[PDB]
From a paper:
As mycobacteria lack DNA mismatch repair, the only process that can ensure low levels of mutation during DNA replication is the replicative DNA polymerase and the associated proofreading exonuclease. Instead, the Mtb replicative DNA polymerase [name] uses a PHP-exonuclease that is intrinsic to the protein itself. Recently, we have shown that in mycobacteria, the PHP domain is the essential replicative exonuclease and that the DnaQ-like DEDD exonuclease in contrast is dispensable.
The crystal structure of [name] [name] was determined by X-ray crystallography to 2.8 Å resolution. To promote crystallization, the C-terminal region was removed (residues 942−1187), analogous to the structure of E. coli DNA Pol IIIα12. On the other side of the thumb domain, ~40 Å away from the polymerase active site, is the exonuclease active site. The coordinating residues comprise five histidines, three aspartates/glutamates, and one cysteine. The presence of a strong anomalous difference map around the metals at the high energy, but not the low energy data set, unambiguously identifies all three metals as zinc. Unique to the Mtb PHP domain is a long, 29-residue loop (residues 77–105) adjacent to the PHP active site.
Author numbering: 7 to 500, 509 to 933
Write the structure that this text describes.
């Protein structure tokens, strides 16, 4: 009654502009005892999911909206438009004639949905430079359920006022009021005692009176608290690229832009403009539950099947076909029944479409010559996955467990992902969009959060400018090295640090460190995730806000992938792997240099050569086996079969190493150590389950097999035990020990045997390794070793190609080449191609491997070298090439790289000759 709600408010998702993080904002909102809060971010609704959930979870009522950017003309119009005289630039259309602000809020779930797509359309259609803009025409099409206002000072109505254009201001206000309706338009009033706001206040209340618009007090909060104001000021500097000293920069006036208490707020408005604060409460109480928007709906695409099938029929049909291909002279024994079991679970859980989709993507990759992976994750324990080509690991010969993948007794979404040649993700993503709908497939946003290291570089540019680099560079070196891609949380220095001393010493560094903490974990920008993609049965604008990446036109989700899946959108990882690129290249090299045409999918898994190579530990550049201590272990282990490859991958991790499991495995395998039983009563019942791993427990699947044998568990229920012994919640451990123990009692085991097993498994289950993932990786390792062992030059060539023009990474493999007796010939205009090549027994340097040279240009060189070349001499090269300053920048680097020495002319010469040629 004498309370208040902030409706105009900027979150950290007003990137580089709002400094109010949602969690502290809610905290504050509550101790000020306020019933509700709004979210009004500049130009986007990326925080909506977070805000809604956080607000709801704290019983504050969320008001969700957006401070739209509105074009001065049509949103499609990319001309800049100004309404006053140049002498009034500072009062005129923001963004130099690009936009005005508009505060918009959702009264109910219809309005929310409408705001989502109004946002989306702003980006799809109304983009000028960095601003996504709506216009009046577009907003009118989607006005239902929305409340708008007359706006902040950067709004249209005030801009008009400030400009002297009273007629236009009043006319603007009537246009907007007409569009949303008399009951959803408010006269927005804001006071930070600035003279910009006072100038307009009278004109403004005139308009309110004239057109009959209620007043609304708001604060345009850009930070939570009053002390936070200084951090806000530094943030704006990161956004502007300007100095704190530099007075001319964009900044706010004093510190009024926090979440003021009902009291302070009523103190400003009650006497001055009766009703303003009360309207906030009228609005808050008017606002509905948004919950229909976050209610999960099954939005998984429906694979289109031939006529007279359904998803389940078609899956059977396809799985059958699959087995036929895979086992062309009849599938072996027990396969069909396994398949039928899986198909049955799958249909039962409602996932046949998903399988069909991933199959179809894999199908396309092959039709297009895109190398896919043998597959990763849980899916490798599914005979269906294997049948359909989703994986290439037959789960049966490797003893992988379907119920680890899809547990019939738990309801939950499996992860079925493609993974392929890193250089071809583009095509894969485009294909998906074509197949499933351009308005139904989107890549997923990531949020660029300000990290510790760039926080400091930022803090320095803020205090010092361009010359700030020195101090900046100075601070950053003092830093402990990473772990291994994660620099030390700043607050943390509140520790192996010398630098800490650096601050206690230098007063300037204390102030840079201070400013950087104010900056940490705010959001710098929006990225596109490396691999996640979201798909839907319905247009995605119906579910979530989205945006268009300006550079390529890519459509990206507004929320991250957990928020998306949280409401029943399908997410898949379209993963690009470079080892797959390297594999494809080595294979190509073998076609070219040896005329063999290798098909990895049919390489034996027992190749003597390979295991020999493994035994030496000459694994530089073989997938997952290159580490130093890895090489040691491989040597100590003398691997001999595929299962050993699968084990090292699992064993070369901190958990098993902590237990010495890897060395133990090695030693036991080579008769240097006896195989200890978990307990004597346990020896014979568990012997075969643990045999392959020389009596040690290495995989999740073994925990399951163990619980089934000894405790009479379902594989499904053993899966559930395994998950739980992983999480370690007392209440659940005890129910489960109850069960485990009872089962073992029933099977006749002493309390000692039960206690041994339990005690062994319990810590081991924190870290136990998913055997399906180890087989998938293992396959790639082995394949990779097989190529190095049997095709050294072809493979090393592929490897070096992947290292780009980086001399440092290259020097690592060149050293390897040398240690294997492979000769490395230099870059050459007549003999080098774009990438490194296998030439007989040699590697020939890649042309693109030199500085300043890329496929783009090398392409035309090889082009012309085919039509007319080889080049006879430097001037012949010039006569065969073309006139261009850019062409000259290239030519220079090729000379340096000695690409021309083949011709037999000193290079100092050629530089001089090149300059004339250009003139
Ligand atoms: Zn702002
Ligand atoms: Zn504004
Ligand atoms: Zn604002």
């Amino acid at each position: 009654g004498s309370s208040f709600v902030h409706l105009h408010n900027h979150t950290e998702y007003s990137m580089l502009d709002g400094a109010a993080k949602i969690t502290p904002m809610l905290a504050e909102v509550e101790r000020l005892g306020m019933p509700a809060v709004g979210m009004t971010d500049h130009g986007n609704m990326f925080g909506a999911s977070e805000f809604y959930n956080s607000a709801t979870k704290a019983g504050i009522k969320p008001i969700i909206g957006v401070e739209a950017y509105i074009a001065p003309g049509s949103r499609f119009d990319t001309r800049r438009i100004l309404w006053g005289d140049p002498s009034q630039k500072a009062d005129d259309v923001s963004g130099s004639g690009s936009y005005t602000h508009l505060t918009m809020m959702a009264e109910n779930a219809t309005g929310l949905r409408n705001l989502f797509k109004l946002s989306s359309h702003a980006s799809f259609e109304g983009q000028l430079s960095k601003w996504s803009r709506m216009d009046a025409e577009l907003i009118a099409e989607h006005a239902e359920g929305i409340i708008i206002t007359t706006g902040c000072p950067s709004g249209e109505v005030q801009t008009r006022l400030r400009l002297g254009q009273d007629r236009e201001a009043l006319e603007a206000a009537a246009k907007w009021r007409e569009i949303v309706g008399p009951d959803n338009y408010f006269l927005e009033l804001m006071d930070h005692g600035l003279t910009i706001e006072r100038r307009v206040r009278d004109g403004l209340l005139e308009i309110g009176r004239a057109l009959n618009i209620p007043p609304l007090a708001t604060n345009d909060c850009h930070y939570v608290t009053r002390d936070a104001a200084h951090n806000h000021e530094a943030l704006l500097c990161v956004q502007t690229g300007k100095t704190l000293s530099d007075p001319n920069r964009f900044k706010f006036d004093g510190d009024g832009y926090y979440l003021k208490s009902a009291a302070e707020m009523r103190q400003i408005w009650d006497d001055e403009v009766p009703g303003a604060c009360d309207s906030t409460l009228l609005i808050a109480e008017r606002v509905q539950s948004y919950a229909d928007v976050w209610t999960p709906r099954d939005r998984m695409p429906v694979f289109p099947v031939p006529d007279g099938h359904d998803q389940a029929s078609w899956l059977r049909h396809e799985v059958d076909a699959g087995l036929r291909r895979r086992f062309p002279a009849g599938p072996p024994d027990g396969y069909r029944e396994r398949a039928a079991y899986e198909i049955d679970v799958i249909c039962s859980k409602g996932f046949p479409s998903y399988f069909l989709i991933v199959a179809d993507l894999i199908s396309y990759a092959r039709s297009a010559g895109i190398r896919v992976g043998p597959g990763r994750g849980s899916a490798a324990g599914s005979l269906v996955a294997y049948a359909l080509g989703i994986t290439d690991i037959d789960p049966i010969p490797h003893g992988l467990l379907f119920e680890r993948f899809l547990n019939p007794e738990r309801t939950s979404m499996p992860d079925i992902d493609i993974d392929f040649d890193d250089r071809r993700r583009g095509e894969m993503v485009r294909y998906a969009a074509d197949k499933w709908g351009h308005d139904r497939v989107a890549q997923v946003i990531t949020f660029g959060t300000i990290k510790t290291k760039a926080a400091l570089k930022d803090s320095a540019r803020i205090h010092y400018g361009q010359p700030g680099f020195a101090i900046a560079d100075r601070i950053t070196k003092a830093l402990p090295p990473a772990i291994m891609a994660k620099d030390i949380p700043l607050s943390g220095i509140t520790e192996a640090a010398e630098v800490r001393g650096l601050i206690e010493t230098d007063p300037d560094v204390r102030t840079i460190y201070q400013t950087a903490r104010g900056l940490e974990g705010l959001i710098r920008n929006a990225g596109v995730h490396a691999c996640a993609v979201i798909m839907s049965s319905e247009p995605l604008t119906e579910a979530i806000p989205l945006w268009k990446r300006p550079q390529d036109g890519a459509i990206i989700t507004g929320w991250d992938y957990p928020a998306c899946e949280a409401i029943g959108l399908l997410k898949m990882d379209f993963l690009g792997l470079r080892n797959l690129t390297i594999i494809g290249d080595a294979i190509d090299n073998v076609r070219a240099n040896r005329g063999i045409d290798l098909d990895l999918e049919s390489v034996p898994l027992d190749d003597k050569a390979t295991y020999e190579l493994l035994g030496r530990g000459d694994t530089l550049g073989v997938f997952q086996l290159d580490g130093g201590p890895m090489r040691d272990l491989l040597r100590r282990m003398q691997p001999t079969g595929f299962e050993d490859v699968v084990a090292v991958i699992a064993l070369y991790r901190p958990g098993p190493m902590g237990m010495n499991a890897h060395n133990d495995y090695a030693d036991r395998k080579n008769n240097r150590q006896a195989i200890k039983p978990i307990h004597p009563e346990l020896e014979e019942p568990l012997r075969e389950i643990l045999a392959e791993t020389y009596g040690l427990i290495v995989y999740q699947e073994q925990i399951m097999r163990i619980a089934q044998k000894v405790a009479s568990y379902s594989l499904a229920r053993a899966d559930i035990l395994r998950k739980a012994m992983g999480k370690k919640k007392r209440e659940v451990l005890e129910k489960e020990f109850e069960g485990f123990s009872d089962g073992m009692q029933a099977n006749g085991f002493s309390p000692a045997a039960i206690k041994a097993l339990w005690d062994t498994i319990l810590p081991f289950a924190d870290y136990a390794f998913n055997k399906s993932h180890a087989a998938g990786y293992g396959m790639v390792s082995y394949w990779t070793a097989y190529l190095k062992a049997n095709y050294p030059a072809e493979y090393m060539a592929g490897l070096l190609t992947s290292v780009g023009d980086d001399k440092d990474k290259a020097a690592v493999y060149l050293a390897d080449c040398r240690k294997l007796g492979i000769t490395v010939l230099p870059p050459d205009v007549n003999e080098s191609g774009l990438n490194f090549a296998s030439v007989g027994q040699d590697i020939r340097y890649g042309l693109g491997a030199v500085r300043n040279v890329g496929a783009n240009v090398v392409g035309s060189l090889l082009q012309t070298r085919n039509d007319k070349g080889k080049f006879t001499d430097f001037s012949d090269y010039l006569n065969k090439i073309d006139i261009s300053a850019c062409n000259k920048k290239v030519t220079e680097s090729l000379i340096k790289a000695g690409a021309f020495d083949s011709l037999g002319h000193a290079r100092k010469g050629l530089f001089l000759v090149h300059s004339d040629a250009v003139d």
